[PDB]
Design a protein around this ligand. Structure first.
Ligand SMILES: Nc1ncnc2c1ncn2[C@@H]1O[C@H](COP(=O)(O)OP(=O)(O)OP(O)(O)=S)[C@@H](O)[C@H]1O
Ligand SMILES: Nc1nc2c(ncn2[C@@H]2O[C@H](COP(=O)(O)O)[C@@H](O)[C@H]2O)c(=O)[nH]1
Ligand SMILES: [K+]
Length: 192
């Protein structure tokens, strides 16, 4: 039973598929609650979606060595803390992570030994509409995320970087491809 790392462009639907997975398989998977310096969106709860901390707190923790990995994204800091992964391990659950491309390569350097899945948009055109539908991004921050998306899409074709690439055209189909990709993960977890 290996950890799971979900990545992809902003707005692809990796958080959506993760939420569906975590509700239907609550006893099998446990979400890695990362730290972030950005403000919480409406409907986001501190401790569940993210550990919302200020910039000074994040930098203080980085010096203290609390983070397995950390990176900046659209002028805000994100990080997978050691305590976040150890919390899921203490619950006897498969840790699932939602990081960017920079985190993916950082995790490659660690010993977490995960399975890498890239949730990809059907095309870059529909990604903008997906990002524009949520409206949480201002026009300036939307362009920054859209620009970084193409770099993420290009790197998704790198051989060996991702174990599974899922195109998120149909959400039910994308979730079906997610479960099948985790079939041996769910099997091994239930096999104990
Ligand atoms: N299958 C889908 N069909 C259409 N729109 C979708 C689909 N999945 C997600 N979206 C859109 O994508 C947004 C929600 O996806 P999220 O999971 O929050 O984005 P994300 O891939 O996690 O990237 P970030 O880092 O959270 S911005 C909304 O605007 C949805 O309308
Ligand atoms: N490297 C890294 N990236 C993260 C982490 N948490 C979220 N991200 C990434 O940061 C971006 C913004 O996330 P959002 O602010 O939309 O939740 C997404 O690409 C997401 O996957 C993290 O802990 N580490
Ligand atoms: K995350």
């Amino acid at each position: 039973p290996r950890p799971v790392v979900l990545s992809g462009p902003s707005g692809a639907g990796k958080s959506t598929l993760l939420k569906r997975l975590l509700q239907e398989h609550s006893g099998i998977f446990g979400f890695s609650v990362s730290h972030t310096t950005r403000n919480p969106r409406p409907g986001e709860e501190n401790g569940k979606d993210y550990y919302f901390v200020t910039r000074e707190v994040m930098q203080r923790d980085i010096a203290a060595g609390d983070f397995i990995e950390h990176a900046e994204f659209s002028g805000n800091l994100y990080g997978t803390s050691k305590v976040a992964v150890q919390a899921v391990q203490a619950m006897n659950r498969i840790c699932v992570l939602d990081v960017d491309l920079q985190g993916v390569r950082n995790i490659k350097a660690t010993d977490l030994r995960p399975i890498y899945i890239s949730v990809q948009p059907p095309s870059l055109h529909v990604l903008e509409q997906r990002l524009r539908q949520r409206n949480t991004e201002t026009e300036e921050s939307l362009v920054k995320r859209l620009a970084a998306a193409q770099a993420d899409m290009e790197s998704s074709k790198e051989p060996g970087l991702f174990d599974v690439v899922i195109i998120n055209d149909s959400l039910d189909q994308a979730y079906a491809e997610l479960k099948e990709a985790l079939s041996e993960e769910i099997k091994k977890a239930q096999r104990t």
